Amino acid sequence: PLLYSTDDAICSKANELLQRSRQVQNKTEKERMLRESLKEYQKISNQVDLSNVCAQYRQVRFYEGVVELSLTAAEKKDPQGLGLHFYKHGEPEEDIVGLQAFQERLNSYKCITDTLQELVNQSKAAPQSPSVPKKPGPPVLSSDPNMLSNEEAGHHFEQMLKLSQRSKDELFSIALYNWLIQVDLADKLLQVASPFLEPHLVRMAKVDQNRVRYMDLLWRYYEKNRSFSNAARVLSRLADMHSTEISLQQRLEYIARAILSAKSSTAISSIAADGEFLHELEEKMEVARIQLQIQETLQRQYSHHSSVQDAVSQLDSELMDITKLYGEFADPFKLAECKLAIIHCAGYSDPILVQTLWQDIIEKELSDSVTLSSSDRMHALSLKIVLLGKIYAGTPRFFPLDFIVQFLEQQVCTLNWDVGFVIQTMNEIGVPLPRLLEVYDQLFKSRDPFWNRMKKPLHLLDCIHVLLIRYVEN
Template structure:
């Protein structure tokens, strides 16, 4: 090794006049990789002793600075010998293992491949050694050439392992220059995250999500925001700045809005993908994040996307009862319209799934889940379509509506005596629903919390007395007598619950 070191020392003295490519090739053959690195870095300094190349780069590479440009190019050629060597090691680390060729004549197998060829493991080890040594260099321009090569060689994981003060600065410089902006910003947040600088990572991720670009899909924007929230939370657990809390709140609000934009895009793809003009609209939703007004006016309202409109007014906290009712009606009518060719059982299942999925979102905020309106609308459809009497009550309980609240709604509807039930030729439909609801309670009293059970049982008994008075005042027929009998039996069971 002394002789190699000695040769390196001598070459370094005259490195500005040395044929670098030739010497580096000889050093590679004897696996003297540190020699390649040291010789090329010395040559770069000797060819540009006044450091005109770095000055040219720092000044933004002005075209009129011919001398600076010449020095800059000279340096890049020196660095290229290093990165070419590293590329060769990368190629060898991925090469298929050598195998003997098919023999043309009898005798021992002949190896046709290069005996100097490194094994995959050796090549990887030499590459890691070179990368480690390269990081010790104080030559900033070499670091930049190395980073650019790592990016171009698709070795970004290795780039992010680099522990250097120059990397952050270089990535920010590239972003300012608008060079592969999305890719470099993607590297920058990963660099910050790797170095546990979560606050900076969150801000870069938020900028990426907001960037107007066709290179970022809406799904990626959603991922960026989700990742930004995670980073911001990690950051605020380390620092306790009020601004961190505000930023996190902004991100969470934005996340809600991005989800609505995704919902709009998915709905358009599902419903209008056969319309050529909608393809542009779908791409438009990919290219940037929209504000709430634009999402409502230009997309949800324009394409009559009622579910998306409901999501937007919920997000905005805008609760106009007339609008909420009409949106729910549109949602339910569309669902019933889409399932018209199905069997009654499948239609009920389809509507149940839709109601439960939306109910889980909105039932907690009654302004956006108008229970009285929904029950009345749905029960009229049940009468019209001759569906199961317990369909609506079981669906509402599945959503999580409390049984006492549900009874209150049905009781109120019954007492209102709306003529619509007569028109539908189902004047006793609501009391039948109430019977189904209360039978469920008698069979399983745990549907009502223990502390409220006695009060609720009394309410049920009081209500039943009222229903019986009402029912017994009507002209008797077999159906009516059957309903009266059912309520009397229910009354007896409820009294036993006391």
């Protein structure tokens, strides 16, 4: 009906590919004339609709058409920098207007993957010599030159890669890679190190939801540099600030970083930002290990089989906001050792508080031991106390003898054992020996109930005398 299209976006390319098959081979005939025709006689083709025309373009290996026509496309898509702030502005689509020009960009992305698969693959014969109906897309492999110039695809690779490495702008680099680099067998983005890789990586990291998909890549690819001894440089970026909560991986990181932890080493310039932060991380590491020990006990309890009804009233509200929450509050199993452990881990200074925690701990261990003790209640007590005194480096004001001693004398009173052995438990916990003398002299005055029955003066003085002369702190 007189219909006539002066400029054609795809018909020209379709016809030209028909001629490429029948008249002009891209690699061996009229390559420069084909480029020039591509720009000036196929300038109208510029933007090509992913269609049958593109399917017949796939069988030939030419790609200078892809890159330059895409340039003219970004010309006919972004007239004056529309693309630059498209990503650069960042997630405004939440409306009918935002998801508008994504069309044919997502199509070029999915299509690129389709092209990657079909172009990389082989013909019917190459995967299977005999040929049944042929899938459109795979390159045919027949009557290839005697010389091993048959494998054009290899330099096709080299060419397209140069295209990636070399461009006036970033248009065919960053823009057409969305559904190609996040699919199998893509090595261009990793090999290239553009000065814009890092900013896109930080932008992806900013959103936790976006970050998780790229998280393993996010740490490495984000940093061009080895980042040899980065500690909390990705940790600030790391989401949920999850240092002491899960403890099924936090300790894995703690050990795999602490068998290299270098404190006072001057590895990183900002002590306040890295040294101070990693110091807090070390405190948190103690927190996580201790809380994890709480978890392991409560989880493998036989007396407490399932843990369905108690743990979630604690976990759902705060999983691990603060250590003392679970250390002093969130332990239905009634652990008190955790309470004083977090009073040392999280410093609190009440003689009455510290003292009561001591009594609560002693009563907890004796009660558990009667229910279950390896040998002698005192021996189980020794197990627990060395465990506590090893994880916690002793603080001189935070480990007063006066507090422990009354309960130790209570234990000697209740459970009769060799006098040298209670001395061995306290001695092996590292308890101050000067304060041992001072406490055992203050306490002796007035014959306090704890020191009654005079079990030690029997042979303790002489045993400790000989023990000391041969050896210290014994």
